[PDB]
Design a protein around this ligand. Structure first.
Ligand SMILES: *C(=O)C[C@@H](NC(=O)CCCCCNC(=O)[C@H]1O[C@@H](n2cnc3c(N)ncnc32)[C@H](O)[C@@H]1O)C(=O)O
Ligand code: NA
Lengths: 328, 6
């Protein structure tokens, strides 16, 4: 049976919620428990009414994200294919009830300061079901860090972390993220100088430049275990492929070209397409506190430029990681 | 940007 909101959000945890993100299908809050921040994603399910202008998803439609979130979180504890580059999953609950007034307070604060595209979630009845996903707090998204990074040396570490995590997930799970825009890449400070991963039993390190990258959001993702494929079939989607104004929206169309509109198949080239979009953001949208003012920094820039112009000739993140000169 | 929007 479903649980009340108070089971996931006891009073102290609920009182410390602040809203951090939103989309058509739900709301993300940060809170604290045992002195540690966490992120809480809340999605209404199974009801007949519109929320933010769209129908609610069913439990069966949220299950792929839950499964993929768990599999990717578990990669931090694996041996042959190990990465911490995907967000940790702490818990998942099915909750029943009206929206907590304390979360409405947080929602209002966000609407007042940042502005929301969503309806104020005050209209849910006491029989409403929700999925509540509790994740590790992964830091701040790359888009919000557009003006906050030190230099292009940091951009290099970010790209290497992303490529390695995707390669590990390709090897372990035949994973494709499929929606790796810069709102779905998080950055957090670390005191570790090197980050560790293992790919098909071979362990390596990546210089951190003081940041640990976490990939989030598996709504469009695909993976498999023992021939059972978990994915989102967007072959008939009437809006996903008609965006404009950002290279992001071309990526959906380019994935559809690569896979012939057959989303169950494994096409790890989609990971390369996203990494190209991310590299493009680093070179064109990100603005750094210290620019490339020395010969050595102009060299790093030239290496990332060379990555941008060559990486689309690689077949997967694994091929990029193992063969591209940027990572030697 | 989010992949889809109101
Ligand atoms: C496709 O149609 C799926 C659709 N999803 C939804 O509508 C559900 C809600 C999406 C929320 C989008 N915004 C974010 O995720 C932002 O919240 C912050 N965030 C999220 N998760 C974390 C964690 N673990 N730690 C820290 N911050 C976190 C980020 O700012 C993120 O950009 C869709 O819109 O894609
Ligand atoms: Na992580």
């Amino acid at each position: 049976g479903p649980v009340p909101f108070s089971h996931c959000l006891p009073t102290e945890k609920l009182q410390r919620c602040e809203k951090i993100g939103e989309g058509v299908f739900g709301e993300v809050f940060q809170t604290i428990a045992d002195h540690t921040p966490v992120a809480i994603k809340i999605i209404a399910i199974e009801g007949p009414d519109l929320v933010n202008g769209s129908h609610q998803k069913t439990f069966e439609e949220i299950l792929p994200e839950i499964i993929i979130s768990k599999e990717l979180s578990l990669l931090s504890g694996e041996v042959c294919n190990r990465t911490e580059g995907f967000i940790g999953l702490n818990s998942v609950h099915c909750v029943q009830g009206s929206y907590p007034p304390l979360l409405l307070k947080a929602w209002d604060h966000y609407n007042s300061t940042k502005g929301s595209a969503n309806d104020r979630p005050d209209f849910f009845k006491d029989d409403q079901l929700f999925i509540v996903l509790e994740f590790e707090f992964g830091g701040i998204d790359l888009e919000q860090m557009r003006t906050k990074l030190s230099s292009l040396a940091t951009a290099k570490s970010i790209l290497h972390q992303l490529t390695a995590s995707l390669a590990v997930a390709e090897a372990s799970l035949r994973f494709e993220h499929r929606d790796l825009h810069w709102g779905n890449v998080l950055l957090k400070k670390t005191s570790l100088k090197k980050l560790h991963y293992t790919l098909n039993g071979k362990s390596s390190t990546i210089p951190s430049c003081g940041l640990q990258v976490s990939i989030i959001d598996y709504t469009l993702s695909r993976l498999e275990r023992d021939g059972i494929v978990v994915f989102c079939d967007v072959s008939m989607d009437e809006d996903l492929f008609t965006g404009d104004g950002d290279y992001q929206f071309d990526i959906y169309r380019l994935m559809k070209k690569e896979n012939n509109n057959r989303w169950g198949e494994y096409h790890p080239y989609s990971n390369v397409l996203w990494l190209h979009y991310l590299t493009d953001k680093m070179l064109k949208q990100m603005t750094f506190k210290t620019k490339c003012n020395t010969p050595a920094m102009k060299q790093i820039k030239r290496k990332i430029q060379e990555f941008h112009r060559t990486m689309l000739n690689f077949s997967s993140a694994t091929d990029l990681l193992c063969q591209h000169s940027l990572f030697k | 940007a989010r992949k889809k929007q109101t």
